[PDB]
Short mmCIF file of C-alpha atoms and ligand atoms in Angstrom, two decimals:
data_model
loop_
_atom_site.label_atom_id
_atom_site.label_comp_id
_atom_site.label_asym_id
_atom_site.label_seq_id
_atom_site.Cartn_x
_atom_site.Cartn_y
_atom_site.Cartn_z
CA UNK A 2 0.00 0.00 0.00
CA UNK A 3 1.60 3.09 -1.22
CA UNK A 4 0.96 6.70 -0.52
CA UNK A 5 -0.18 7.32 -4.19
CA UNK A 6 -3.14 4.29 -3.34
CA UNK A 7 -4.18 6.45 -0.38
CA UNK A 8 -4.69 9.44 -2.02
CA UNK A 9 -6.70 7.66 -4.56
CA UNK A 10 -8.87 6.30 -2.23
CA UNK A 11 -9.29 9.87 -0.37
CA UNK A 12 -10.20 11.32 -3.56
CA UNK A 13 -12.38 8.56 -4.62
CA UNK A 14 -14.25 9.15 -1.72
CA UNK A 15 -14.19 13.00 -1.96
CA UNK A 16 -15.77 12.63 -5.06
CA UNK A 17 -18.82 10.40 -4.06
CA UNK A 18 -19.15 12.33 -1.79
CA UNK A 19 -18.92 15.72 -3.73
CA UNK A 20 -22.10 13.93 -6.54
CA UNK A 21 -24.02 12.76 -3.78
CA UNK A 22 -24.20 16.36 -2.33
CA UNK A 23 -24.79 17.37 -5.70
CA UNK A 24 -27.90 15.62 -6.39
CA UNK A 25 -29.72 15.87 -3.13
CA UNK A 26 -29.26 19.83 -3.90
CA UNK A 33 -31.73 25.16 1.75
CA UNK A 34 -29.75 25.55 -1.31
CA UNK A 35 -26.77 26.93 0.43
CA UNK A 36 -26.08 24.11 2.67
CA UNK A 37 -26.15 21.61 -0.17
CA UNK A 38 -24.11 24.12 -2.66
CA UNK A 39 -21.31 24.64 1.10
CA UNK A 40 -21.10 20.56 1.29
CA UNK A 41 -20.32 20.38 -2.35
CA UNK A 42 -17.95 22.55 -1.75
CA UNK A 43 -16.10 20.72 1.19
CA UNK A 44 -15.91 17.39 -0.54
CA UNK A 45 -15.29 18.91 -4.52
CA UNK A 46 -12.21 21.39 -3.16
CA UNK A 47 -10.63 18.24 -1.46
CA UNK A 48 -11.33 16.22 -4.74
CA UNK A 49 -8.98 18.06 -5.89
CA UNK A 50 -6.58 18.30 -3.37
CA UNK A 51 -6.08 14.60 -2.82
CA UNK A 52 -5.90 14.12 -7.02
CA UNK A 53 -3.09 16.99 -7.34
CA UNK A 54 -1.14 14.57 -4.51
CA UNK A 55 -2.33 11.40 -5.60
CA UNK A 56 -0.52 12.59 -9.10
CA UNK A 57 2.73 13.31 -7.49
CA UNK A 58 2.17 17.34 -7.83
CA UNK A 59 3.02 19.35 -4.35
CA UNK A 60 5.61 16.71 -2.48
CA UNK A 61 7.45 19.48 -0.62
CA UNK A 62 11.18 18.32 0.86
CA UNK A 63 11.96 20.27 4.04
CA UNK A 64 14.94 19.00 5.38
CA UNK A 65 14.57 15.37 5.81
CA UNK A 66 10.70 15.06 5.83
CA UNK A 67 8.29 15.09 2.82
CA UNK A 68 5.25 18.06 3.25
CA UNK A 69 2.08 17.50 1.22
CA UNK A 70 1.29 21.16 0.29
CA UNK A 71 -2.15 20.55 -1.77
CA UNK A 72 -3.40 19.09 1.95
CA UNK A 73 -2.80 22.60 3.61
CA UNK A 74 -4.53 24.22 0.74
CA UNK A 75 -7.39 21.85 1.24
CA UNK A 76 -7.52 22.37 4.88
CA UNK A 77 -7.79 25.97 4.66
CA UNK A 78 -10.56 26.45 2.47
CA UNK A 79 -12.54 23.62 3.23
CA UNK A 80 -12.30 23.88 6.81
CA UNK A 81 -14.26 27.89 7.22
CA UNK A 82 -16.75 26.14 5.07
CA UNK A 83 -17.95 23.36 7.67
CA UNK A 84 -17.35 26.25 10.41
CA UNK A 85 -19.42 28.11 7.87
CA UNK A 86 -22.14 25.15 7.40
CA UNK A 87 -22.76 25.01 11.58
CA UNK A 88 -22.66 28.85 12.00
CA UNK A 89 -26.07 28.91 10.03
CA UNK A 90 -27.20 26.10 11.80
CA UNK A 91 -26.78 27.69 15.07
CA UNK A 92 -27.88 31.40 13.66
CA UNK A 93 -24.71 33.55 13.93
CA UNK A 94 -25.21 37.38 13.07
CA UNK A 95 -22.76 38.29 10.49
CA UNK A 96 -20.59 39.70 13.51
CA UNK A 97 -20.27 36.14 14.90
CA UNK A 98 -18.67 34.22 11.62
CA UNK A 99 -16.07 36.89 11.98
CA UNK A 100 -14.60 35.91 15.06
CA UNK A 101 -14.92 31.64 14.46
CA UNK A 102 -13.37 31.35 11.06
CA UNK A 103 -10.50 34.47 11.84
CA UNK A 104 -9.87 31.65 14.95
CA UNK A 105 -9.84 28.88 12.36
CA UNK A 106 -7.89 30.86 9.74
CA UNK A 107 -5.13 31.69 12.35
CA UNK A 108 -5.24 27.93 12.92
CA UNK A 109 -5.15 26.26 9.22
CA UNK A 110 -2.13 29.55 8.56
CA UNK A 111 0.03 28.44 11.45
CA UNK A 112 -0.14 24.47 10.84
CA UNK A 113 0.76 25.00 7.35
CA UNK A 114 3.56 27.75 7.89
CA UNK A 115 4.88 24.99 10.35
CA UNK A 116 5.06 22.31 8.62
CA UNK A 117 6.89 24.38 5.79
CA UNK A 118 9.70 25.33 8.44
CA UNK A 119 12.71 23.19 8.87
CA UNK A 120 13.92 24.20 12.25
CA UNK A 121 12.34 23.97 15.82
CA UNK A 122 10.05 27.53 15.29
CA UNK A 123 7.95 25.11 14.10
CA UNK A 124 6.64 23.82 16.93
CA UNK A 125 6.13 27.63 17.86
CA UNK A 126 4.23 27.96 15.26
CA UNK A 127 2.25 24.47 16.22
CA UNK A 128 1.84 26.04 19.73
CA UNK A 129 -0.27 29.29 17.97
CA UNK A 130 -2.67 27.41 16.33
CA UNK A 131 -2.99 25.11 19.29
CA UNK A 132 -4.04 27.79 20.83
CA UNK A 133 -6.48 29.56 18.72
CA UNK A 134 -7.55 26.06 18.43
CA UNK A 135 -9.06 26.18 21.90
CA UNK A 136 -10.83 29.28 21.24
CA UNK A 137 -12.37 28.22 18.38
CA UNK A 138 -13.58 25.15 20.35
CA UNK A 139 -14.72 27.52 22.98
CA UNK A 140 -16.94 29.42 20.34
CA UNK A 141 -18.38 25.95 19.31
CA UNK A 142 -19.21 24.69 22.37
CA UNK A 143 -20.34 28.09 23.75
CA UNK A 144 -21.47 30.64 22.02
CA UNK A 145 -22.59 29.10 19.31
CA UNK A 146 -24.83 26.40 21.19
CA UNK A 147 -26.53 29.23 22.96
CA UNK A 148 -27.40 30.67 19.65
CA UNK A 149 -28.52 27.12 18.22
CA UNK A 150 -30.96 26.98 20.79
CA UNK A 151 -32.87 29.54 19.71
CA UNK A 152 -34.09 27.31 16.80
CA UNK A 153 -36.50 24.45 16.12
CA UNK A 154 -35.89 21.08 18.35
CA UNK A 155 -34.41 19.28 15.09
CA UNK A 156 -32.30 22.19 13.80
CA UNK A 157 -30.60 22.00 16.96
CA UNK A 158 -30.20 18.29 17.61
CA UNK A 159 -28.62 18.32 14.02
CA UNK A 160 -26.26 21.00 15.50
CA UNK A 161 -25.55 19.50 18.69
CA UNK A 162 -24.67 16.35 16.45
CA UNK A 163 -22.51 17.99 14.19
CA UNK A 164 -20.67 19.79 16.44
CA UNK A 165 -19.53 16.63 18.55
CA UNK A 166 -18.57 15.22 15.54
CA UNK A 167 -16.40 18.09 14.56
CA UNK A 168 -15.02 18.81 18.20
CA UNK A 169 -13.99 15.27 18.66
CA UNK A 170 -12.54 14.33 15.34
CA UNK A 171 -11.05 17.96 14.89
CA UNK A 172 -8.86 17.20 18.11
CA UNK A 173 -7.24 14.70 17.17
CA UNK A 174 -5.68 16.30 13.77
CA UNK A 175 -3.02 18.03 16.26
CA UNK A 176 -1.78 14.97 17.66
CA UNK A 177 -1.52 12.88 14.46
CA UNK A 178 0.43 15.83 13.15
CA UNK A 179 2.98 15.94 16.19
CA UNK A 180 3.06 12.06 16.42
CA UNK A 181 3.92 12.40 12.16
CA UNK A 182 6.36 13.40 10.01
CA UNK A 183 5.71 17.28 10.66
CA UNK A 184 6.65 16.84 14.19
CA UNK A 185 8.73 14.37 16.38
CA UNK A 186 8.35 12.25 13.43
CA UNK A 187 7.42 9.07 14.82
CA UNK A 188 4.54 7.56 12.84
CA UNK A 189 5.99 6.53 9.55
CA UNK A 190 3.78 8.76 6.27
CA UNK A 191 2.18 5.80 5.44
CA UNK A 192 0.71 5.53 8.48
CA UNK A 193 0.54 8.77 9.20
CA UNK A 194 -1.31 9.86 5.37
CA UNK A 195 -3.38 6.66 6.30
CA UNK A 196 -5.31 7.78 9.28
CA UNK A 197 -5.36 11.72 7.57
CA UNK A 198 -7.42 10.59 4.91
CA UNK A 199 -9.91 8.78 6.90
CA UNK A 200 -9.99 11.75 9.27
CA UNK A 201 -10.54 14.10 6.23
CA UNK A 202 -12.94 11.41 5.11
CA UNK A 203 -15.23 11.32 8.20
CA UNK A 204 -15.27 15.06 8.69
CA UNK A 205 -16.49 15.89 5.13
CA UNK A 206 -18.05 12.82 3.76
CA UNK A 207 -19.17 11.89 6.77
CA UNK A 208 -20.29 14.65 8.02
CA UNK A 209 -22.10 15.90 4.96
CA UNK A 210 -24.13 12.27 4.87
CA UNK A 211 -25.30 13.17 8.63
CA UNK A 212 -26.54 16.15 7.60
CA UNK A 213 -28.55 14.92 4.50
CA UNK A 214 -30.20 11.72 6.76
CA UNK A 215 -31.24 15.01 8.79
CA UNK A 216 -33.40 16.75 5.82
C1 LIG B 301 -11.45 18.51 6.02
C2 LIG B 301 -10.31 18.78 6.86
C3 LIG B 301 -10.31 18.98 8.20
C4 LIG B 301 -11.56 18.97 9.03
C5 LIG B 301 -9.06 19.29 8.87
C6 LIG B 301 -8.89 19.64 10.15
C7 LIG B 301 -7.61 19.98 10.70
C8 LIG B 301 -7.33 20.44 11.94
C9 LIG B 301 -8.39 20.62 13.00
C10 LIG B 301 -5.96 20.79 12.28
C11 LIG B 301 -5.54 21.40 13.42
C12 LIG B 301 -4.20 21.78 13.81
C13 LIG B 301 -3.96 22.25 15.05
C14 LIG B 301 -5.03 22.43 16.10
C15 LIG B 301 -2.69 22.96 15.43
C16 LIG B 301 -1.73 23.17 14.27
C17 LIG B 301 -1.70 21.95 13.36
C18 LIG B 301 -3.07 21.54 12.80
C19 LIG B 301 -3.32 22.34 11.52
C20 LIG B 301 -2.98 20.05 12.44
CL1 LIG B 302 2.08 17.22 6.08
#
């Protein structure tokens, strides 16, 4: 099993994904998912092609992933903000928190020397506030809606909170950090991660409407 074979199989996925969202399109939810899942398509074809292997010093960086990750990512932040009913005042502060997040993992990763774990520390950081704002804020304003609207938030959001969590740990515990898990392994249990929170997500949302 080589690293070319998992990116296949990410974008394979991706791109079930991406025509199932397609065809079930409330426009704007359908139109944000197709989004998620067709922009990391992409991604994991440019990298399953060969195109965007990054050397930096002795480890290999996957730049189309970072791409990905930062457009993709405001857009589910995006997709449970008008779930939970944020005034255009309230998206501002939850994806500048994830920006600062998906801008200092990938600036990291791109740095040979040990800043980059001060750079890791900055988005671990605004990592927690942005889990603040999901847990917080943005459940108060959820509840202001319909019983369904928010279970379907209150669903989504675990999913996200949890699975999101665990991205900064398989990073450390991979070639970006102490370099421990091999890439295989490490590419392995990134694509099912980007898998679940896209796909995955996206097909929770859908058995909801
Ligand atoms: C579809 C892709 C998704 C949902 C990717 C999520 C990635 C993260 C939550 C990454 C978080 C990071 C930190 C909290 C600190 C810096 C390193 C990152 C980017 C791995
Ligand atoms: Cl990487």
């Amino acid at each position: 099993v080589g690293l070319t074979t998992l990116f296949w199989l990410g974008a394979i996925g991706m791109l079930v994904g991406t025509l199932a969202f397609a065809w079930a399109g409330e426009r704007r939810y359908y139109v944000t998912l197709v989004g998620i899942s067709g922009i990391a398509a992409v991604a994991y074809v440019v990298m399953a092609l060969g195109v965007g292997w990054v050397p930096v010093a002795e480890r290999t960086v996957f730049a189309p992933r970072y791409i990905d990750w930062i457009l993709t990512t405001p857009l589910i932040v995006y997709f449970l903000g008008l779930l939970a009913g944020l005034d255009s005042r309230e998206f501002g502060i939850v994806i500048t928190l994830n920006t600062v997040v998906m801008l200092a993992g990938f600036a990291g990763a791109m740095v040979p020397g040990i800043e980059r774990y001060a750079l890791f520390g900055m988005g671990a950081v605004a990592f927690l506030g942005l889990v603040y704002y999901l847990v917080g804020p943005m459940t108060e304003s959820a509840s202001q809606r319909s019983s369904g609207i928010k279970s379907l938030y209150v669903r989504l959001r675990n999913l996200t909170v949890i699975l999101w969590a665990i991205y900064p740990f398989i990073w450390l515990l991979g070639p970006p950090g102490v370099a421990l898990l091999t890439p295989t392994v490490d590419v392995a249990l990134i694509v099912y991660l980007d898998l679940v929170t896209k796909v995955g997500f996206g097909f929770i949302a859908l058995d909801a409407a």
